Structure formats: C-alpha cells, structure tokens
Copies of this chain bind each other. A is one copy, B any other.
Amino acid sequence: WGLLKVEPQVAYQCLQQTQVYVSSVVNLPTQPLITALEEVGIKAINWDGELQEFPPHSLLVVLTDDYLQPQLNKINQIALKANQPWLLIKPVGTILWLGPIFQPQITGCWECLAQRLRVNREVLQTALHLATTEIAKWIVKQGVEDTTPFPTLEGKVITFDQRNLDLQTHILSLRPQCPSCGNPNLLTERAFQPLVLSSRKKQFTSDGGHRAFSPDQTVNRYQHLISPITGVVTSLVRASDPNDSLNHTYNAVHSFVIASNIGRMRRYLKHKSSGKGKTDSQSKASGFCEAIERYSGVYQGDEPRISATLAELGEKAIHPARCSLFSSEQYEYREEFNRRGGVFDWIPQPFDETKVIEWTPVWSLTEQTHKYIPTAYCYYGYPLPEDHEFCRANSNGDATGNTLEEAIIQGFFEIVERDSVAIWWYNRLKRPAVDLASFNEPYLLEVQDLYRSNNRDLWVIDITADLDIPTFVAVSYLKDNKHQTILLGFGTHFDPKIAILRAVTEVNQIAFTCDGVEVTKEFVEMREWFKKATIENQPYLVPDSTVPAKVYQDYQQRWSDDIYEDVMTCVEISKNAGLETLVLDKTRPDIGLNVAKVIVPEMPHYWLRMGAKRIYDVPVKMGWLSTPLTEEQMNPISVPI
C-alpha cells in the first residue's frame, strides 16, 4: 500500500471519499476482487448495472471473459450518459487484459476499442493483485498526486501473459467518428465541403523522393496504431528479408486486402497481407504506409454515399464502365473468361443504369467540382447484391502521405504508371533502352553488376506515354536457363533518377528471393508466367536496338519546390490530354495519416481491361503504330506484376 509513495495516512483520506463499484458482465465472481479491494483499504461495493447516477469520485470496474461481449454496449452507454469513468478487466484465461480507464470526453469509449478489435479479429490470484494495483494507482492519480508522478491505465490496455511472462501495452485511440462517443458521420460533412489544398514548401529532399518529413519519424509518431488489440496494423513478423543486404531491404506487415466470403480459404491464405521492399532503410515505413492505406480503404458504414441511379445524377455522375473500362466482348464472354482467368482479372457483370446504387462524392480537380463514383468501386468489402456485382474495388490510385497533396501525387503517379504499363504491354511494343551510366548513379551500375554476377541480365526500357511523365520498366532475366524467371519492375516519377530507382527497387525486390523462392504459396499467378517468360517468345521485353538509348538529359525537369505546384502541374498535364482527375479523401480522422484515392476515368489498369480506347489510340498518336491494333490482336497474357 506504500509502494505508491504518496502518503502513509493522508492517502487514506482519498480512500475515505472514493467508492469502487465492482460488477460482472457474464458470470464472473465479483467477491474476490471486492475483498482484495478492502484488503488495501479501498471501499468497494458490488454493483449490477441498474444504477446510473454515481457519487463524485467513483470508479466502476467491470469484469469479463471477452472484450466483445454485447452487454458491454449497455454499460458503455451508461458511462457516457453519466460521464462516469470505468475500468474493464479480463482476469480469466492465460492472457490477462487490464483494460483502459474509459474516461468519457477525454479518452476513447468502449465502442472505439470494440470497433478496432472487430476489424482486428477477422483472423488466478495475480490478476486480482494487478487489478488492485491499477485501481489504487488510479485512486491517487486524481485526488492528490499530479499527472506526471502517477502513471495510469487511462486509455491504455495492459496485456500480460503468464505462460511466457511478458507484458505489452496498447494505446486506445479516441475516434472522432465513433457512433457513441463522437460525431457518427464526420465523413459526410468532410466530403461535402469543397477540397482545398494548402501550399507546403519542401525543406529536405536529399533522398527517398520529395518528402517533407522523415518516414521513420512518421512510424515513430504512429507506433500507437501498431497493436493487435487496439491498433490497425498487426505488425508481428515486421522485417522478413535478411538485414545483410544493405543496398535493398524489406519488411512485412499484416492487414486485410481481400474480403472473400470463403472461410476455409480465408483461414490459411487471405490472412495477413503484403507490402515489402525499399532500397532505403524505409522498407518498414513503406509497408506500414501500404497497410495504413489498405485499412483506410475498407468499408465500415461511415463512408459518405447517396442512394440513387444514374438518371437523377445526370452529368454529375461518372458511369462505372467509364472507370472499369471493360470491353463489350469481355462482358459477353464473361463466364468462360472468369472460369479460365484469375481472381485479379475477374470480369464483373455489366452495369445497368436501371438499378439504384450508392454513389460516393469525389472532388474533380479539373472542373473543381463534385462528381459521384460508385461506392463499390472506392471502398473494399462493400456489400453488393449477388446479381449486381458490377465492380470490385482495387488499389489503383490509392496512396498514402503525410499531407493530402503528397498522397495525390503518389496516386497520380501510380495511375500514370498503370496506364503506361498497359499501353506498352498489350500492344507488344518495342521501346528504346536507357543507359544507367548516363543517370549519374553508381547504385544502378553496381546492382546491374551484381545481377550479372548472379547470372541475371538486367536492363531498363523507357515506356513514357503522351503525358510525358518519366516512366520506366526494369526487366531482368536469368541467363543460360530453361526458366528465365523474368522479373519486372515499374517506376514513374517527374524526376527520371528516382523513377529509375523505383524501377530497380521493384525488380530486385524479388531478385534476392531466389534460391529458396516461396513459389506457388503466393506467386501462383507468377508460376505459369515463369513457365513462358522467355525473351524470344516475348520480343517486346527486349529494347529496340535500332533506336538509340535514351539518356538522363532526354527528359525535361518538371518537379517544383512546393507540392501544391506539383498537384497543379499534374492537373494541367491530365487536362491537356483530355482527362479528368478526381480525388477521394480516404483519410480516417482517428488515424491522421493522409490517404487519398486518385481516380481518372479513361486511365486503364494493366489487367485485361480492353474497353479503354487509350490502349488502342495512344500508340497511334505518338506514331508507334500506323494503325490501331484490333482487340484480338493484343497480348492475351495479363501483367504478372
């Protein structure tokens, strides 16, 4: 009782004014905790939950076996209504959860923790003494002692395991969009307001692209979101690739990307997620950013939408076929194409304007107005009718950044990369090479030499489209082998140097995985590719020797000092090509790290989306072809990467 070093007998005065109402949720013995509480002098009286009003300086303790018991939803309503602090304890099982001191209007309520646990659970006497210690610490932290000399479990879950004797701390996050403790529809007011971009001049861009803040600092700041109970990223494995390779490193994260209803297949395969690889020490930062973007892209019911059909919306709505861009021939052969195709290139049902769907507002930058995109195309896991699965949400254009403008730039670069890759791949076009020596980067030369030493010839091809945004594809194939195992990487940026860096990082993220490749475990779609990825059979994968190789001085410099001007110049670049750039703010207020989805209608993905006239017309416009290619004359193989 004196280990709190607060007072020998003055602290008892606090115990003379504080009552602790102990209660059980589902069949827990309340008496032992009560007796433990009078053992140290705390006046504890049993409660059942019917009482709402409480005397000042009171704490309500509730015991449970699971943190998602429905009865808690009642208690969470009682506490918020009465503004009463309460503690949640799980004394049973091998793992003990001390739970947070739910203080209304200051810390998160129970609903925040329950929502995060649900989003995260898609996959004896010592408890009493620890609970007594935590309660006693809370008693003195509010009556006499100050904030600093009194650590408390307020808004903090302590997970203690006796079997391994290890203790972990999870930080409960107050969600401003929580239905119970906050504004339940903050997103619909945020989206309806016009989107405004604030200028933010960069300060340090020595390496890792044009970022105004260190991604390591971002991970350090957002480590409070890294938790398997009260967090959004499961962490767990963290780094996957060995740390010996300093030039290129990797790190893995666990999240949810696909929401298939097959439990058996989800049990082993769909669990965890991907996102791994960077030449800089920010591979873990990139994986964390991708996990954050995937978590922000999932549907949870708070998303802004309006139930209507295309007729009422008129010109304000973008037709789903204008974004998905599937050819009518693909639709009319949907069944057998889906039967022979993979999950990535699944062909959805044709969209009919007769039915009524939910449209999410988006900010059209080119017209500076509000358009409407089908919600199923924006958010993962959106429940669609079994007869109206007209589209499935993908990661194309979704991007992460500290500022919204940086996320917009990343998303637009992703869209441009996908368009250029599709145009080059499906036309089977030959494009000039790029000499890495002219790029003034010894890293490219040394990684090329390393790949050649490992019996893998590597080179880079320039596939820049009419947008004139420097984009490159790095291709590496194993020599003197029947299985070439062609590895591809794509990199697009205003700065050609970092575009080449992105391409080489993407191509060598798989290069070091050789000699023990995880094969069919998750590269099943890439298996048959390696059975046919031969340079002689794919002549477009080798550069056109006739045209001289492009150099670093062949590309104009377009990047500006401030990211706002980068967003602007991207807008005029898109406008000059007769395209409309739309931005959807996926940033969750409870997280704070900006996530944005950039949607451009006519821009296609690299999957079998043959309905886009860009693939047919852009090579003609640049003169790469004299006549547009017929749909059946294009490449019948999807892009493996």
Contact = CB atoms under 8 A, between A and B. Distances in A.
Interface of A: 3-5, 93-94, 98, 124-126, 129-130, 133-134, 137, 149, 151, 153, 158, 160, 162-167, 169, 204, 206-208, 213-214, 216-217, 220, 243-247, 280-283, 440-442, 446, 450
Contact of A207 (B133, B160, B247): B247
7 contacts: A3-B124, A126-B126, A129-B129, A204-B244, A206-B246, A206-B247, A281-B282
A130 B130 CA distance: 11
A133 B94 CA distance: 12
Given A243-B220, A281-B282, A441-B442, A167 B167 contact: yes
A165 B100 CA distance: 13
Given A244-B213, A244-B217, A134 B165 contact: yes
A348 B408 CA distance: 67
Contacts of A169: 166
A404 to B, nearest CB: 21
A94 B164 contact: no
A244 B214 contact: yes
Contacts of A160: 167
Task: Count the copies.
Answer: 2
A129 to B, nearest CB: 4
Contacts of A208: 246
Given A206-B246, A216-B283, 5 more contacts: A133-B162, A133-B165, A166-B169, A208-B246, A214-B243
A94 B94 CA distance: 25
Given A126-B126, A126-B130, A244-B217, A162 B3 contact: yes
A133 B160 CA distance: 13
Nearest to A150: B163
Contacts of A163: 3-4, 137, 149, 151
Nearest to A245: B206
Contacts of A283: 216, 281
Which has the most chain B C-beta neighbours within 10 Å: A160, A214, A246? Answer: A246
Contacts of A282: 246, 281
A125 B151 CA distance: 20
Contacts of A133: 126, 162, 165
Contacts of A3: 93-94, 124, 162-163
A204 B217 CA distance: 29
Contacts of A280: 246
Contact of A165 (B94, B167, B216, B281): B167
A134 B126 CA distance: 12
